[PDB]
């Protein structure tokens, strides 16, 4: 009769993130004799299908990083445990709502909100600066336009926009519309504004210092390797702002310049929701739940929230744990304004299982091996398996 072993699998950034959650499970582990946390790091694109086959079989973990996405889907899957009335929600008041609600599915929280963000068009101000530019393109037909001044004047590319469907997902916002409609029950994918919206994400590939799509696999990476090093802009979250500072374009911090992303057709600009949640895995014996609620009230309390932003620069869930020095932090700064323009997810579990299909549809409409309505149609029939209560 020895301690209780937990194991957590973290989904973050292996370079940027996880040691800083490394130092809290020795915090955790130091104050609590009682209970050891096996650290685990699965790396983000297969930790969805890796928890979903563990889950129902045997080496699943007793706690998850799992996604604001995935939460209502395992919590529909049941293999999550429900958090109401536990230790874990001591503080429920002290989290921002939108973020429990998310967590939340039919009525009932399944995670505790851990970390919180949204995609906005960071840019180089040297290289705006240099091509006599002061302010960002406020919508997408200026980020076309303000893209051939600076290659013209510097000779850098001006964008290097994402083939994924979660960044493609903020042309849908831009032009005035959604993958799916709920209230209705319809797939809008292959409808008039989803067409005109892919086909202006799909325009921002061909022209002068816009950069062309990328086809592999690892193309995030090169997105990432050409902004840090210095690509005038791209459309990126909070949690690479770590990352963009270890390169030379962004030496100087203050140099990091951060926008809302442009808006379309319908006037306002259009981000998606994202974030993580931890939540402690259901098929788990009693001891490993109680030791895992435990954990989860450390993981998500105003101490570690303020330290993780201050050493991540991701954003906090909870309104307490914004100090003056987390404040201070440009990013932070940055970001909250932003904020402004992310748009919540709606009541759907396979919200972000439409997402699937999409990548691999939008990956041949930009590497140039369907036509757009070739790809958005087949995305239309894909998505009515997953979700068969429309009707396209
Ligand atoms: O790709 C969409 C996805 O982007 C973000 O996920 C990050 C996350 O911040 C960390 O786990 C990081 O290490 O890797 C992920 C790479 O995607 C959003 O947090 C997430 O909501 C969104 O689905």
């Known amino acids: 009769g020895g301690p209780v072993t937990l194991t957590w699998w973290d989904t973050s950034n292996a370079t940027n993130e996880a040691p800083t959650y490394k130092a809290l499970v020795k915090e955790f582990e130091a104050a609590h004799k009682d209970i050891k946390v096996k650290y685990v790091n699965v790396p983000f694109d297969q930790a969805q299908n890796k928890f979903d086959t563990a889950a129902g079989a045997t080496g ?30 001591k503080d429920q008041d002290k989290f921002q709502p939108s973020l429990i609600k998310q967590a939340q599915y039919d009525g009932k929280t399944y995670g505790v909100p851990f970390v919180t963000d949204t995609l906005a068009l960071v840019y180089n101000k040297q290289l705006f600066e240099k091509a006599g530019l002061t302010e960002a393109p406020r919508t997408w037909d200026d980020l076309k336009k303000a893209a051939a001044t600076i290659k013209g004047k510097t000779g850098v590319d001006g964008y290097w926009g994402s083939t994924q469907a979660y960044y493609a997902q903020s042309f849908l916002y831009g032009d005035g519309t959604d993958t799916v409609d709920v209230p209705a029950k319809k797939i809008t994918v292959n409808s008039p504004e989803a067409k005109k919206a892919y086909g202006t994400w799909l325009g921002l590939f061909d022209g002068k210092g816009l950069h062309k799509a990328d086809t592999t696999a690892d193309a995030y990476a090169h997105i990432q390797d050409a902004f840090v090093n210095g690509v005038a802009s791209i459309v990126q979250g909070p949690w690479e702002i770590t990352n963009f500072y270890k390169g030379s374009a962004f030496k100087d911090k203050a140099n990091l310049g951060i926008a809302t992303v442009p808006a379309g057709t319908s006037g306002k600009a ?4 994202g974030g993580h949640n931890l939540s402690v895995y259901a098929g788990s014996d009693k001891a490993h739940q109680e030791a895992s609620l435990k954990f989860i009230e450390f993981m998500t309390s105003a101490k570690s929230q303020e330290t993780i932003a201050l050493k991540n620069s991701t ?9 003056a020095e987390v404040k201070a932090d440009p990013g932070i700064a940055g970001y909250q304004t932003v904020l402004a323009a992310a748009r919540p997810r709606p009541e759907l579990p396979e919200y972000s299982s439409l997402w699937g299909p999409l ?11 369907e036509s757009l309505d070739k790809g958005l149609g087949n995305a239309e029939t894909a998505i009515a398996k997953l979700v068969p209560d429309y009707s396209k």
């Open 60 to 89: 699943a973990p007793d706690i998850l990083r799992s996604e604001v996405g995935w939460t209502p889907a395992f919590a529909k899957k049941g293999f999550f445990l429900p958090l109401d009335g536990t230790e874990a929600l």
């Open 359 to 369: 990548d691999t549809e939008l990956l041949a409409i930009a590497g140039g091996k």
């Open 270 to 273: 259009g981000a998606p929701t």
């Open 315 to 323: 954003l906090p869930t909870r309104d307490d744990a914004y100090t």
